[PDB]
Short mmCIF file of C-alpha atoms and ligand atoms in Angstrom, two decimals:
data_model
loop_
_atom_site.label_atom_id
_atom_site.label_comp_id
_atom_site.label_asym_id
_atom_site.label_seq_id
_atom_site.Cartn_x
_atom_site.Cartn_y
_atom_site.Cartn_z
CA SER S 1 -16.30 -9.89 14.76
CA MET S 2 -14.85 -11.35 11.43
CA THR S 3 -10.54 -9.92 10.94
CA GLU S 4 -10.98 -8.86 8.49
CA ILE S 5 -7.43 -9.33 5.50
CA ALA S 6 -6.96 -7.61 2.83
CA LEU S 7 -4.61 -9.01 0.11
CA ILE S 8 -2.30 -7.03 -2.34
CA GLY S 9 0.34 -6.73 -4.71
CA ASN S 10 1.68 -6.63 -7.54
CA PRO S 11 0.68 -8.76 -10.32
CA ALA S 12 2.69 -12.13 -10.56
CA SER S 13 4.39 -11.64 -6.64
CA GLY S 14 2.49 -14.57 -6.10
CA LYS S 15 -1.08 -13.53 -4.53
CA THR S 16 -3.56 -15.77 -5.78
CA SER S 17 -0.84 -18.94 -4.89
CA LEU S 18 -0.73 -17.50 -1.30
CA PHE S 19 -4.01 -16.93 -2.19
CA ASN S 20 -5.56 -20.34 -2.87
CA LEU S 21 -3.18 -21.86 -0.49
CA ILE S 22 -4.90 -19.86 2.03
CA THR S 23 -8.43 -20.20 2.07
CA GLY S 24 -7.77 -24.23 0.20
CA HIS S 25 -10.80 -24.27 -2.47
CA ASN S 26 -13.39 -22.58 0.18
CA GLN S 27 -13.72 -19.27 -1.54
CA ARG S 28 -16.63 -17.12 -3.39
CA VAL S 29 -15.89 -14.95 -6.75
CA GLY S 30 -18.30 -12.08 -8.17
CA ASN S 31 -17.82 -8.69 -9.05
CA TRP S 32 -17.80 -5.45 -7.32
CA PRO S 33 -20.44 -3.29 -7.64
CA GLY S 34 -20.59 -1.27 -10.88
CA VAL S 35 -17.87 -3.08 -12.60
CA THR S 36 -16.49 -6.31 -14.16
CA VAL S 37 -13.62 -6.55 -12.18
CA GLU S 38 -13.54 -9.55 -10.07
CA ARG S 39 -14.71 -10.21 -6.52
CA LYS S 40 -13.39 -12.78 -4.81
CA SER S 41 -12.57 -13.75 -1.15
CA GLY S 42 -12.34 -16.57 1.22
CA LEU S 43 -12.11 -17.64 5.33
CA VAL S 44 -8.79 -18.76 6.09
CA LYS S 45 -8.92 -22.21 6.33
CA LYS S 46 -6.83 -22.76 9.67
CA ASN S 47 -8.88 -20.24 11.10
CA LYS S 48 -12.18 -19.35 10.30
CA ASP S 49 -12.75 -16.36 12.23
CA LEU S 50 -10.12 -14.95 9.55
CA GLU S 51 -11.52 -13.55 6.30
CA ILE S 52 -9.11 -12.85 3.37
CA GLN S 53 -9.87 -10.11 0.97
CA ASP S 54 -8.50 -10.45 -2.61
CA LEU S 55 -7.43 -7.76 -4.43
CA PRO S 56 -6.80 -7.00 -7.75
CA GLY S 57 -2.97 -7.30 -8.66
CA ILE S 58 -1.68 -4.07 -9.26
CA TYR S 59 1.87 -1.80 -9.34
CA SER S 60 0.47 1.77 -7.88
CA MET S 61 -3.01 3.51 -6.17
CA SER S 62 -3.65 5.40 -9.71
CA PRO S 63 -6.44 6.80 -10.64
CA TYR S 64 -6.02 5.00 -14.41
CA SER S 65 -7.47 1.74 -14.02
CA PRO S 66 -10.93 -0.38 -12.67
CA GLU S 67 -8.34 -2.57 -10.66
CA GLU S 68 -6.77 0.20 -8.97
CA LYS S 69 -9.27 2.32 -8.27
CA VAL S 70 -11.56 -1.01 -6.39
CA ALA S 71 -8.89 -1.89 -4.77
CA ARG S 72 -8.10 2.06 -3.45
CA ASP S 73 -11.84 2.67 -2.52
CA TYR S 74 -12.09 -0.49 -0.26
CA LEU S 75 -8.98 0.27 1.47
CA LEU S 76 -10.06 3.92 2.36
CA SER S 77 -13.34 2.23 3.51
CA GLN S 78 -12.19 1.25 6.21
CA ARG S 79 -13.88 -2.17 6.43
CA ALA S 80 -10.57 -4.06 5.89
CA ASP S 81 -8.87 -4.58 9.64
CA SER S 82 -5.09 -5.20 8.23
CA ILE S 83 -2.96 -5.24 4.63
CA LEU S 84 -1.12 -7.93 3.43
CA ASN S 85 0.83 -7.30 1.25
CA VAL S 86 2.22 -10.04 -1.04
CA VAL S 87 6.19 -9.51 -2.30
CA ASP S 88 7.78 -10.23 -4.77
CA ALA S 89 11.12 -11.09 -3.61
CA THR S 90 13.20 -11.07 -6.80
CA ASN S 91 12.01 -7.50 -7.69
CA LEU S 92 11.92 -6.23 -4.29
CA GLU S 93 12.48 -2.29 -4.96
CA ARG S 94 9.70 -2.15 -8.37
CA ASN S 95 6.80 -4.06 -6.07
CA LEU S 96 7.57 -1.79 -3.05
CA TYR S 97 6.77 1.37 -4.82
CA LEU S 98 2.94 0.05 -4.15
CA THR S 99 4.21 -0.51 -0.66
CA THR S 100 5.03 2.40 0.03
CA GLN S 101 1.68 3.88 -0.83
CA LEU S 102 -0.32 0.76 0.83
CA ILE S 103 1.17 2.41 4.41
CA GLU S 104 -0.02 5.69 3.99
CA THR S 105 -3.69 4.00 3.83
CA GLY S 106 -3.03 4.17 7.45
CA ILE S 107 -4.79 0.33 8.08
CA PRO S 108 -1.26 -1.37 9.33
CA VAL S 109 0.49 -3.39 6.17
CA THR S 110 2.46 -6.98 7.10
CA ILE S 111 4.34 -8.09 4.12
CA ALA S 112 4.40 -12.22 2.86
CA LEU S 113 8.14 -11.93 0.57
CA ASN S 114 7.07 -14.28 -1.15
CA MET S 115 9.85 -15.62 -3.75
CA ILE S 116 12.50 -16.34 -1.15
CA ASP S 117 13.06 -19.59 -2.34
CA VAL S 118 13.85 -18.21 -5.77
CA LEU S 119 16.27 -15.72 -4.73
CA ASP S 120 18.68 -18.56 -2.51
CA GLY S 121 18.46 -19.59 -6.30
CA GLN S 122 19.94 -16.62 -7.68
CA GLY S 123 22.56 -15.85 -5.47
CA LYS S 124 20.59 -12.84 -3.68
CA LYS S 125 19.59 -12.53 -0.14
CA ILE S 126 17.23 -10.58 2.05
CA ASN S 127 17.79 -9.01 5.57
CA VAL S 128 13.51 -10.29 6.57
CA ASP S 129 14.28 -8.35 10.39
CA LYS S 130 16.55 -4.76 8.68
CA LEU S 131 13.58 -4.64 5.52
CA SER S 132 10.84 -5.25 8.60
CA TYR S 133 12.91 -2.52 10.69
CA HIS S 134 13.46 -0.51 8.30
CA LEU S 135 9.93 0.01 6.52
CA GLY S 136 7.82 0.20 9.80
CA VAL S 137 6.41 -3.07 9.08
CA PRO S 138 5.93 -6.56 9.66
CA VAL S 139 7.75 -8.37 7.34
CA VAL S 140 7.76 -12.42 6.49
CA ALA S 141 9.33 -14.71 4.47
CA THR S 142 7.31 -16.81 2.43
CA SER S 143 7.39 -19.60 -0.56
CA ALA S 144 3.93 -20.45 -2.53
CA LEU S 145 5.47 -23.12 -3.96
CA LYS S 146 7.54 -24.45 -1.46
CA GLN S 147 4.50 -23.99 1.23
CA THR S 148 6.86 -21.86 4.09
CA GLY S 149 5.49 -18.95 6.41
CA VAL S 150 1.98 -19.09 5.33
CA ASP S 151 0.28 -19.92 8.13
CA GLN S 152 3.23 -17.85 10.36
CA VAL S 153 2.35 -13.95 8.08
CA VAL S 154 -1.30 -14.86 8.05
CA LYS S 155 -0.89 -14.74 11.89
CA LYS S 156 1.05 -11.36 11.73
CA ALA S 157 -0.79 -9.82 9.68
CA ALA S 158 -4.73 -11.22 12.15
CA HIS S 159 -2.65 -9.27 15.19
CA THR S 160 -1.69 -6.32 12.83
CA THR S 161 -4.87 -4.52 12.94
CA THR S 162 -6.70 -1.15 13.35
CA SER S 163 -7.31 -1.81 16.83
CA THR S 164 -3.99 -3.53 17.58
CA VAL S 165 -1.79 -1.25 16.66
CA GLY S 166 -1.35 3.08 17.90
CA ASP S 167 0.63 5.82 15.75
CA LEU S 168 1.59 4.87 11.61
CA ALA S 169 4.69 4.99 11.19
CA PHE S 170 4.97 6.35 7.50
CA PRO S 171 7.56 6.65 5.08
CA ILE S 172 9.56 9.91 5.83
CA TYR S 173 10.64 11.92 2.46
CA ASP S 174 12.64 14.14 2.12
CA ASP S 175 12.10 17.57 5.04
CA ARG S 176 10.80 19.74 1.61
CA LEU S 177 8.05 17.26 0.97
CA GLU S 178 7.32 16.57 4.60
CA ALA S 179 6.86 20.41 4.68
CA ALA S 180 4.19 20.67 1.52
CA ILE S 181 1.96 17.36 3.34
CA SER S 182 2.06 18.98 6.21
CA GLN S 183 0.93 22.47 5.17
CA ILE S 184 -1.93 20.32 3.04
CA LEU S 185 -2.42 18.22 6.30
CA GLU S 186 -3.42 22.00 8.18
CA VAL S 187 -5.46 23.35 5.29
CA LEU S 188 -7.63 19.84 5.30
CA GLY S 189 -8.51 19.67 8.56
CA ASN S 190 -11.28 17.21 9.39
CA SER S 191 -11.73 17.13 6.06
CA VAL S 192 -11.21 13.60 6.15
CA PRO S 193 -10.22 11.32 8.58
CA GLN S 194 -6.99 11.13 11.10
CA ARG S 195 -6.16 7.71 9.75
CA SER S 196 -5.83 8.66 5.86
CA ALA S 197 -5.19 12.67 5.99
CA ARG S 198 -1.63 11.12 4.55
CA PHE S 199 -2.91 9.14 2.37
CA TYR S 200 -5.26 12.27 1.08
CA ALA S 201 -2.70 14.80 1.48
CA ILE S 202 -0.36 13.47 -0.67
CA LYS S 203 -2.69 13.32 -3.51
CA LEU S 204 -4.36 16.12 -3.34
CA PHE S 205 -0.46 17.24 -4.03
CA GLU S 206 0.33 14.86 -7.24
CA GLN S 207 -3.35 16.48 -8.60
CA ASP S 208 -4.58 13.10 -8.41
CA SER S 209 -8.06 13.57 -10.15
CA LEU S 210 -10.34 11.38 -8.38
CA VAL S 211 -9.20 12.60 -4.99
CA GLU S 212 -9.81 15.87 -6.06
CA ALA S 213 -13.30 15.09 -7.48
CA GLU S 214 -14.50 13.30 -4.59
CA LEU S 215 -12.92 15.66 -2.21
CA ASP S 216 -15.68 18.44 -0.73
CA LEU S 217 -12.98 21.46 -0.20
CA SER S 218 -13.94 25.07 -0.43
CA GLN S 219 -12.10 27.66 -2.75
CA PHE S 220 -9.85 28.86 0.28
CA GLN S 221 -8.85 25.60 0.28
CA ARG S 222 -8.45 24.88 -2.59
CA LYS S 223 -6.10 27.81 -3.25
CA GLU S 224 -3.88 27.34 -0.49
CA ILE S 225 -3.01 23.47 -1.26
CA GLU S 226 -2.38 25.16 -5.20
CA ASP S 227 -0.71 27.46 -3.65
CA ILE S 228 1.90 24.35 -1.31
CA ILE S 229 1.60 22.00 -4.34
CA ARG S 230 3.61 25.97 -6.91
CA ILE S 231 6.48 26.46 -5.07
CA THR S 232 6.79 22.85 -3.65
CA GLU S 233 7.66 22.23 -7.50
CA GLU S 234 9.58 25.68 -7.51
CA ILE S 235 12.13 24.64 -5.33
CA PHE S 236 12.48 20.59 -6.96
CA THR S 237 12.67 22.53 -10.43
CA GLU S 238 9.85 18.88 -11.24
CA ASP S 239 6.05 18.65 -11.21
CA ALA S 240 4.29 17.34 -8.62
CA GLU S 241 3.47 13.41 -9.12
CA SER S 242 7.46 14.00 -10.08
CA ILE S 243 8.68 14.69 -6.63
CA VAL S 244 6.31 12.11 -4.87
CA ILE S 245 7.42 8.70 -7.76
CA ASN S 246 10.98 9.91 -6.93
CA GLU S 247 10.19 10.26 -2.97
CA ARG S 248 9.21 6.60 -3.11
CA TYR S 249 12.11 4.96 -4.39
CA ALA S 250 14.47 6.51 -3.31
CA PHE S 251 12.93 6.48 -0.31
CA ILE S 252 12.49 1.83 -0.67
CA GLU S 253 16.26 2.71 -2.34
CA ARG S 254 17.63 3.97 1.21
CA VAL S 255 15.25 1.10 2.73
CA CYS S 256 16.85 -1.65 0.52
CA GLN S 257 20.42 -0.45 1.38
CA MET S 258 20.14 -0.40 4.98
CA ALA S 259 18.54 -3.74 4.74
CA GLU S 260 21.11 -5.11 3.34
C1 BGO K 301 2.13 -24.06 -14.68
N1 BGO K 301 2.57 -22.40 -13.60
C2 BGO K 301 3.77 -22.22 -14.00
C3 BGO K 301 4.34 -22.53 -15.62
C4 BGO K 301 5.63 -22.10 -15.97
C5 BGO K 301 6.05 -21.45 -15.04
C6 BGO K 301 5.42 -20.32 -14.58
C7 BGO K 301 4.01 -21.25 -13.92
C8 BGO K 301 3.41 -20.37 -12.56
O1 BGO K 301 1.70 -20.41 -12.11
O2 BGO K 301 3.35 -19.34 -12.14
C9 BGO K 301 2.82 -19.17 -11.13
C10 BGO K 301 3.61 -19.14 -9.71
O3 BGO K 301 3.32 -20.79 -9.92
C11 BGO K 301 4.83 -18.30 -9.36
N2 BGO K 301 4.92 -18.81 -8.06
C12 BGO K 301 4.14 -17.53 -6.78
N3 BGO K 301 4.73 -17.69 -6.20
C13 BGO K 301 6.10 -18.33 -5.74
C14 BGO K 301 6.90 -18.87 -5.06
O4 BGO K 301 6.23 -18.95 -3.74
N4 BGO K 301 8.06 -19.04 -5.58
C15 BGO K 301 7.50 -19.49 -6.57
N5 BGO K 301 9.34 -20.51 -6.67
N6 BGO K 301 7.34 -19.51 -7.54
C16 BGO K 301 6.01 -19.08 -6.94
O5 BGO K 301 4.76 -17.64 -9.67
C17 BGO K 301 3.59 -16.90 -10.85
C18 BGO K 301 2.66 -15.97 -10.42
O6 BGO K 301 2.22 -16.63 -9.59
P1 BGO K 301 1.00 -15.93 -9.44
O7 BGO K 301 -0.04 -16.57 -8.10
O8 BGO K 301 0.18 -16.66 -10.57
O9 BGO K 301 0.72 -14.10 -9.40
P2 BGO K 301 -0.13 -13.00 -8.85
O10 BGO K 301 -1.69 -13.77 -8.23
O11 BGO K 301 -0.69 -12.70 -10.44
O12 BGO K 301 0.12 -12.50 -8.08
MG1 MG K 302 18.48 -10.51 10.85
#
């Protein structure tokens, strides 16, 4: 059985550059079914038992672009063994916004902390093991330009899979949001897989139109969820989508502070 490694990150994070280094000239290109979004994959040049599934460069997993939808559907399909998340070290906080959402899918994340050579030139520093510790994911510093850390991150990702990793270490948000997520999980029951339950619970909280349309929820489930959102919005005096956005960035800021 092939180990399937999903490669994803923001646009201009160096994902293509790393894809090309990892796979060399041996790639397969097409489209995702029913859409014109490119579907690209390649075997790891130095370990052909590993397949890299490239995913479109995105900033978030929102319902508003074909590229974001392709990434989400693929990651929620449970076909990937590992997520290899390419992160631009020179724009860390902005890049980790997506990372928090990737962790929540329940497919173990490994980070290629890319552009590390640029960071050195800007007079900036990132303490890699502290960043890893506080994100709850492996992190390996890479440079696609200098060609460093690449084989190392691929090896880590290959040994950090849905088979090898036990409990999910997910970003923990404010107690008030966690209460809402917990109650949505109770309402969900077995309507979604345990592995991705948190992804779905957060999406429901923020009234993601794709999840709402796809899930077969009872009238009672929908009423329970509506109630949870209403009271949670009242206690934050903020709309549900904004609450989640603010909590993601707060977590990211805390991690980046504790990692310097
Ligand atoms: C002809 N080329 C240029 C001429 C002048 C200026 C830039 C370019 C140009 O091509 O920049 C590319 C990279 O080479 C560089 N780049 C990528 N990784 C690294 C890295 O680790 N370090 C450095 N210094 N640069 C990197 O960052 C860019 C984005 O990498 P993409 O892979 O495209 O990102 P997505 O796949 O969208 O995620
Ligand atoms: Mg250290």
